[PDB]
Amino acid sequence: LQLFIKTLTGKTFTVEMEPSDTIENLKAKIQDKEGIPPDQQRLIFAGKQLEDGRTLSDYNIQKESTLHLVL
Numbered sequence: 724l725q726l727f728i729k730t731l732t733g734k735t736f737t738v739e740m741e742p743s744d745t746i747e748n749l750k751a752k753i754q755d756k757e758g759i760p761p762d763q764q765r766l767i768f769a770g771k772q773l774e775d776g777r778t779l780s781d782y783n784i785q786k787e788s789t790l791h792l793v794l
Contacts, residue, residue, distance in 0.1 A: 724740065726738050726740055726789075726790060727790070728789075728790050729789055729790070729791055729792065731793060731794075736756060736757060738752045740752065741779070742778065742785075743778055743779070743780060744778060744779050745775065746776070746779070747761065747775040749766070749773070749779065750775075753792065763794055765792070766792055766793075767790065767791040767793060768784060768788065769782075773790070
């Protein structure tokens with residue numbers, strides 16, 4: 724639901740998602756939120772890059788998980 728997205732520049736921001744949302748939908752929210760186009764977003768959870776095939780649940784993403792955004 725509430726996700727923390729951390730950039731390498733030390734900025735955190737938050738987005739609200741559902742676990743059935745797709746990765747590409749997460750990226751469209753980050754674009755809405757922060758202006759970063761989806762093809763400049765690389766999102767890492769654990770040490771693994773999230774792929775547009777999939778849903779947040781597919782990665783065991785939960786309330787208050789942190790994802791890294793690499794631009």
